[PDB]
Amino acid sequence: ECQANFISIKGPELLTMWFGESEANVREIFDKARQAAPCVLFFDELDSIAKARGGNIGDGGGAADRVINQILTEMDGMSTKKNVFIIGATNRPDIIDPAILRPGRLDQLIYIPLPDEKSRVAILKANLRKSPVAKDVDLEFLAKMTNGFSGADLTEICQRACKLAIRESIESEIVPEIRRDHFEEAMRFARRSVSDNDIRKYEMFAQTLQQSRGFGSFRFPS
Amino acid sequence: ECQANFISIKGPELLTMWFGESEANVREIFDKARQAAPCVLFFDELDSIAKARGGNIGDGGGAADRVINQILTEMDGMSTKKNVFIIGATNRPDIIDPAILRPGRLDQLIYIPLPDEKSRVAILKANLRKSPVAKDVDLEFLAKMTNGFSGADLTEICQRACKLAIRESIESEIVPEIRRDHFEEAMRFARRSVSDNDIRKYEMFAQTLQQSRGFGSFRFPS
Amino acid sequence: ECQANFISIKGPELLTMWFGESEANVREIFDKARQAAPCVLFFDELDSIAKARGGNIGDGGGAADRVINQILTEMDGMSTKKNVFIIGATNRPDIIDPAILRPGRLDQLIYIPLPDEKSRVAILKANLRKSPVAKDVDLEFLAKMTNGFSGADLTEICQRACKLAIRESIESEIVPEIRRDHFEEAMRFARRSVSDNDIRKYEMFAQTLQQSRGFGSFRFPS
Ligand SMILES: Cc1cc2c(C(N)=O)cccc2n1-c1nc2c(c(NCc3ccccc3)n1)COCC2
Ligand SMILES: Cc1cc2c(C(N)=O)cccc2n1-c1nc2c(c(NCc3ccccc3)n1)COCC2
Ligand SMILES: Cc1cc2c(C(N)=O)cccc2n1-c1nc2c(c(NCc3ccccc3)n1)COCC2
């Protein structure tokens, strides 16, 4: 949307320098993120170091480590007039170090929920955009049926339907179109990896920081 | 079946680089696994590092270490169009790090049960394929008798029968054929190393990830 | 179905004699259950005493108490030729004392799952059998939409729709028919009291006692 460059740093690249005690690697990451103006810096599974160290308690130490410290130092020294942007992604925000969320570094926190009915059709069609889809196979109804399903759950449904279609095509040689029955049968092994307790614990975090109470009704004098 | 090359990495080779802090060894493993296209990469007792560190809890840290991190990094960077394939083997999947089982790396999990009656005959005949077997020695009945027996249990039964036959042949000098009595007597010291609690705990893991409930009966409108 | 009498003993009646140290009350319960031949004896929330004492561990004692002991004594002394029948109901079977499940008393254990699509229509129509239901209000679709919903979840949906209809009827005086909009709007506050972890923990109990392994394929000689 911003016509900006994109740099992705997954968990293994972040945890490699933690184990290796070689911490000059973030230097070039932030250097090449700023020369490609405008760019966007994306940190995947930022909680990887916290999980590797234990998480909320772990050892006698807190939630502060060296790699996140280097990221904090590099982010503090950046120029606001540049168009470089840092995006952090995590699934466990309770073990994220509080100092990275301080105002001025990552003060903006937004919650990514489960895909809704409108967004699930997009996940199904993204998976099936390379496959022969029959006319009778209605993705709107399939997305309506699954409600608490994650993108991964729909992904494995599509993969299992494709596997069934491929197997039927192979065994039928001794049809080049995914049929309604393939999706109907593969719908039986429908998992739901995200539990309700997880949604509750993410919400407790969400309106932990919402706090829209107290000053809800204000009237100015004149 | 695929006419592909095979590379086996046992537990000691994986745990040697963990203790030695020398982690360039996975680099050449994955390099020589990909140049021999088509190949299959097999990791034996992947939980060796987790057992050496403690397992489910162990120290204050979680289930993430450096060697599994290197394997994750190498697997993430591979090309899907190549025919290289990675197979992980473990006996304790509860202590396996969750990140290696993420979709895209080792999402496919299949359970290897105890050999059934048809498969136990194969284990017996594989062990006895180099030994003189008498006609009256019926392996079908022997495999039928042992039910909750592992391949190792049948292996030691065959080894003990061979030991008894060799000892009788040596002492009789002062017959070059394994007799029915050798197997009948060696059948007395029949162990069963796998307990029922183990089977129960493996199943709890199995339909932990099965979840074939909820969407079992679906009817399309038209 | 058996044209038999029915006696229901809820949790409070069972826990009253536990606190009151007055344990002759089960005597008349079992006496009047057997004189009304044929009858059926139903014990609701049998785990109430275990919950009141702590459950799996609780105090230094085990899972045995006095009231369940009296029920065991009364059940052991009954005549099998009589048509009296005892049914125990519980939601936590992990804290149920093992001795009540011994063969001869309550050896038969069956699992009551969440209602399926066919059974959910019955729950909706049982709740709405006394209310004016509009023609366009399709209960089949409503039951299809809710999948992991308990009978209580559908019950509160129906109650909330009735409350909305009653409120609109009262405020409109200053219509005597539940409309499609009443159910559509009340569908927004749809709870799901039973979590997936609960279903998993009930299943672990279920094929704890299933054990259909080992002797799955048997062939007789002749
Ligand atoms: C293959 C695919 C897998 C996947 C997964 C997953 N855990 O497998 C999760 C989220 C999106 C996913 N996609 C996906 N991939 C794409 C698109 C798309 N739809 C938009 C969207 C994005 C985030 C959210 C909702 C819906 N979804 C759209 O076009 C590009 C590719
Ligand atoms: C000596 C031998 C020991 C052993 C053991 C063991 N813990 O001792 C476990 C599993 C298979 C084993 N084998 C074995 N070895 C072989 C074969 C064979 N049968 C097929 C099979 C494979 C896996 C499973 C079932 C049955 N079994 C077949 O031909 C090659 C050698
Ligand atoms: C008001 C009512 C509430 C309720 C609840 C609840 N937690 O509110 C749970 C289960 C059944 C319930 N019913 C109910 N009540 C009735 C019926 C019926 N349908 C059959 C049925 C039974 C058990 C199971 C499924 C479906 N369901 C049938 O006619 C008699 C009354």
mmCIF file of N, CA, C and O and ligand atoms in Angstrom, chain A residues 115 119 122-123 126-127 129 151-152 155, ligand 1:
data_model
loop_
_atom_site.group_PDB
_atom_site.id
_atom_site.type_symbol
_atom_site.label_atom_id
_atom_site.label_comp_id
_atom_site.label_asym_id
_atom_site.label_seq_id
_atom_site.Cartn_x
_atom_site.Cartn_y
_atom_site.Cartn_z
ATOM 1 N N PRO A 115 -9.564 -14.934 11.523
ATOM 2 C CA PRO A 115 -10.251 -14.411 10.340
ATOM 3 C C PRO A 115 -11.756 -14.590 10.462
ATOM 4 O O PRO A 115 -12.242 -15.617 10.938
ATOM 5 N N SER A 119 -12.960 -12.727 5.645
ATOM 6 C CA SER A 119 -11.536 -12.990 5.495
ATOM 7 C C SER A 119 -11.212 -14.455 5.246
ATOM 8 O O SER A 119 -10.188 -14.747 4.620
ATOM 9 N N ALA A 122 -11.063 -15.357 1.580
ATOM 10 C CA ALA A 122 -9.771 -14.987 1.023
ATOM 11 C C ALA A 122 -8.712 -16.051 1.268
ATOM 12 O O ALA A 122 -7.940 -16.356 0.355
ATOM 13 N N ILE A 123 -8.662 -16.627 2.471
ATOM 14 C CA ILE A 123 -7.687 -17.674 2.752
ATOM 15 C C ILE A 123 -7.950 -18.904 1.895
ATOM 16 O O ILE A 123 -7.017 -19.505 1.352
ATOM 17 N N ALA A 126 -6.967 -18.059 -1.752
ATOM 18 C CA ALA A 126 -5.521 -17.964 -1.908
ATOM 19 C C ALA A 126 -4.889 -19.343 -2.019
ATOM 20 O O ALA A 126 -3.987 -19.555 -2.835
ATOM 21 N N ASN A 127 -5.347 -20.288 -1.200
ATOM 22 C CA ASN A 127 -4.870 -21.658 -1.287
ATOM 23 C C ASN A 127 -5.285 -22.338 -2.583
ATOM 24 O O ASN A 127 -4.496 -23.103 -3.147
ATOM 25 N N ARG A 129 -6.079 -20.881 -5.498
ATOM 26 C CA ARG A 129 -5.878 -20.084 -6.702
ATOM 27 C C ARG A 129 -5.054 -20.801 -7.763
ATOM 28 O O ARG A 129 -5.090 -20.393 -8.928
ATOM 29 N N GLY A 151 -6.076 -19.481 9.947
ATOM 30 C CA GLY A 151 -5.628 -19.615 8.572
ATOM 31 C C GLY A 151 -4.934 -20.939 8.325
ATOM 32 O O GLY A 151 -5.074 -21.533 7.253
ATOM 33 N N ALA A 152 -4.184 -21.424 9.315
ATOM 34 C CA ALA A 152 -3.546 -22.729 9.202
ATOM 35 C C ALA A 152 -4.558 -23.862 9.127
ATOM 36 O O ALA A 152 -4.312 -24.847 8.423
ATOM 37 N N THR A 155 -5.811 -23.871 5.713
ATOM 38 C CA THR A 155 -4.731 -24.302 4.834
ATOM 39 C C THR A 155 -4.624 -25.815 4.791
ATOM 40 O O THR A 155 -4.526 -26.402 3.709
HETATM 41 C C1 LIG D 1 -1.736 -19.749 1.870
HETATM 42 C C2 LIG D 1 -2.171 -18.728 2.916
HETATM 43 C C3 LIG D 1 -1.971 -19.439 4.075
HETATM 44 C C4 LIG D 1 -2.324 -18.640 5.123
HETATM 45 C C5 LIG D 1 -2.324 -18.846 6.513
HETATM 46 C C6 LIG D 1 -1.878 -20.138 7.192
HETATM 47 N N1 LIG D 1 -1.549 -20.127 8.604
HETATM 48 O O1 LIG D 1 -1.789 -21.140 6.571
HETATM 49 C C7 LIG D 1 -2.740 -17.839 7.366
HETATM 50 C C8 LIG D 1 -3.161 -16.625 6.850
HETATM 51 C C9 LIG D 1 -3.162 -16.420 5.481
HETATM 52 C C10 LIG D 1 -2.737 -17.442 4.619
HETATM 53 N N2 LIG D 1 -2.644 -17.507 3.253
HETATM 54 C C11 LIG D 1 -2.973 -16.438 2.339
HETATM 55 N N3 LIG D 1 -2.116 -16.141 1.340
HETATM 56 C C12 LIG D 1 -2.399 -15.153 0.489
HETATM 57 C C13 LIG D 1 -3.531 -14.445 0.636
HETATM 58 C C14 LIG D 1 -4.395 -14.751 1.661
HETATM 59 N N4 LIG D 1 -5.630 -14.016 1.847
HETATM 60 C C15 LIG D 1 -5.618 -12.737 2.523
HETATM 61 C C16 LIG D 1 -5.467 -12.899 4.033
HETATM 62 C C17 LIG D 1 -4.278 -12.550 4.650
HETATM 63 C C18 LIG D 1 -4.142 -12.689 6.020
HETATM 64 C C19 LIG D 1 -5.198 -13.171 6.772
HETATM 65 C C20 LIG D 1 -6.388 -13.515 6.155
HETATM 66 C C21 LIG D 1 -6.524 -13.377 4.785
HETATM 67 N N5 LIG D 1 -4.111 -15.732 2.497
HETATM 68 C C22 LIG D 1 -3.826 -13.293 -0.386
HETATM 69 O O2 LIG D 1 -3.014 -13.186 -1.539
HETATM 70 C C23 LIG D 1 -1.636 -13.475 -1.284
HETATM 71 C C24 LIG D 1 -1.453 -14.807 -0.640
#
